[PDB]
Amino acid sequence: KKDISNVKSDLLYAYTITPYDYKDCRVNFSTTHTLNIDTQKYRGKDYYISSEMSYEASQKFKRDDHVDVFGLFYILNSHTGEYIYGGITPAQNNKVNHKLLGNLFISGESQQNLNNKIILEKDIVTFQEIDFKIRKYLMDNYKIYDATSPYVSGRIEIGTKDGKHEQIDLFDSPNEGTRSDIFAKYKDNRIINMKNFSHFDIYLEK
Amino acid sequence: KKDISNVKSDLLYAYTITPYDYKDCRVNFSTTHTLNIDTQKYRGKDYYISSEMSYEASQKFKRDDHVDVFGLFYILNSHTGEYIYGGITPAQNNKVNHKLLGNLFISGESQQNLNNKIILEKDIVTFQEIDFKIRKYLMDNYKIYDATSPYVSGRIEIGTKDGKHEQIDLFDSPNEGTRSDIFAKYKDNRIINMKNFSHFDIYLEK
């Protein structure tokens, strides 16, 4: 397997990044595996976002649909395009604010309360957006990916109102551990409806 | 299976098209499944070709390589991009002319000589380019895809100097029979070196 210090290294680099956050963009057209979205209003002439997704995900969107974008690039220096995986939801029409409830469980420590630290402004959100914001919070506040951090494993659990949980591994660097490898998981464009969202639980093992 | 008149219908439409033929273009960058190539000198500002290929094929090309393009689009009305499958070879440096030798075998007729009808100007060529030129010749001269054509099956056989043959089905319309379906086969970017090329044989069954 891959050694923990390499994993952290990969992730520190990969997630130290500025996400693309564009609201209400029109889908120009679909390709075999991607959606080409108009971001000219934000980035200038001829600019577009190229979102690679699974077939099932893509079929939910068609030419001219209005969409919101939240994704992390896996390529740099790419002309008029910005390349990401998934990160697409139907455009949010009315303004909205969701203050998330959450808890932090660090090995051998007492539960920490993280309520209201993370706020979302969409009713329908991608796991990619949720994942990123939480990781960033953890990186910023707990330096989870620093070489000297004591964490050796951990995950995020998204809890829904039916009592179920969705897990997201926090220390996984597949294949060569490049952004393309690490962000590939977002290609399913998994989304969650805030109305079903309960709270999140983070587990870090020392 | 698919009925023959539908197949011909699909192919008539699909192959009635003007190919993109651009020489000496620079590769801008690679994505997970495509190559983004600079065609600004031919199509204008910000224009590019996007060539989708198999992993193995793509790895043969890197940023800044000079390449020649010969491909058929599978998408229309796509902004500053032109989308195709494969169709990429290392740029041809010196001028060249290859007059191909070939034969036509139509069921119950005598062999027809097709020598020198098809000419190539590259030493290294894609099957896509070879396939297209021959099909077009057949469409133009034998109307193989017309509803009233008598052909019910057939193929092209590319013969190499070692005595081997590569077959290309002339009447295959997979899946929904869209250009995306029919041209997907070109994604392997299969190429042939003219020095190994012997002649081609076409078989049409009535």
Which own/partner pairs from A195-198 qualify as long-range (CB within 8 Å, at least 24 positions apart)?
A: A195/A123, A195/A161, A196/A160, A196/A161, A196/A162, A197/A98, A197/A100, A197/A158, A197/A159, A197/A160, A197/A161, A198/A101, A198/A159, A198/A160, A198/A161
Helices (H), chain B: 4-14, 40-43, 55-58, 127-142, 179-183
Q: Determine whether the interchain pair A83/B31 forms a contact, defined as Cβ–Cβ distance below 8 Å.
A: yes
Query: Which candidate in B27, B36, B73 is best for mutational testing of the A interface (most A CBs within 10 A)?
Result: B36
Q: How many residues does chain A have?
A: 206
Over B42-84, what HEC string results?
Answer: HHCCCCEEEEECCHHHHCCCCCCCEEEEEECCCCCCCCCEEEE
A6 and A77, same domain (yes or no): no
CATH number for position B65: 2.40.50.110
A103 & A126 share domain: yes
Burial class from Cβ neighbours inside 10 Å (0-12, 13-18, 19+) for residue B59 reads exposed
Q: E strands of A47-128, at which residues?
A: 48-52, 66-71, 81-85, 88-90, 98-99, 102-106, 112-113, 119-120, 124-126
Compute the nearest-CA separation of A120 from chain B (Å).
30
Same domain? For B40 and B71 the reply is: yes
Strand order in the sheet with B112-113: B112-113, B102-106, B197-205, B153-160, B165-169
Q: Which domain, by its residues, includes A59? A: 17-91
Structure tokens at B141: 């001269």
For residue A7, the 8-state DSSP code is H
The encoded tokens of residue B70 equal 């010969």
Residue with tokens 């109305």: A195
Provide the CA B37 distance to its chain's centre, in angstroms: 18
**CA triplet A51, A54, A60: central angle to 5 degrees?**
80
Selection from A55, A34, A73 nearest residue A182 by Cα: A73
Resolution in Å equals: 2.4
DSSP state of A196: G
Let me know how long chain B is: 206
Same-domain status, B60 and B136: no
Exp. method: X-ray
A173 and A196 fall within a common domain: yes
Quick one: which of A137, A132, A104, A115 has its CA closest to A198? A115
CATH of the domain at A159: 3.10.20.120
Q: Which of B91, B120, B153 is the last residue of a domain?
A: B91
Residue that terminates a domain, selected from A69, A91, A113: A91
Q: Please, which residues have CB within 8 angstroms of residue B90's CB and are 6 or more apart in sequence?
A: B65, B66, B67, B68, B124
CA A25 – CA A70 distance, rounded (Å): 11
Contact B46 A83 (CB under 8 A): no
Could you give the 3-state DSSP secondary structure of residue A168? strand
Rounded CA-CA distance A191/A172 in Å is 21
Distance, in angstroms, between A78 CA and closest chain B CA? 7
Q: State whether A77 and A99 are in the same domain.
A: no
Q: Which residues contact A41 (CB under 8 A, 6 or more apart)?
A: A25
- Which of residues B38, B61, B91 is at a domain's end? B91
The number of angstroms, rounded, from the C-alpha of B120 to the middle of its chain's C-alpha atoms is 12
Chain A residues touching B28 at Cβ < 8 A: 78-79
Query: Whole-angstrom Cα distance, residue B64 to residue B26?
Result: 5
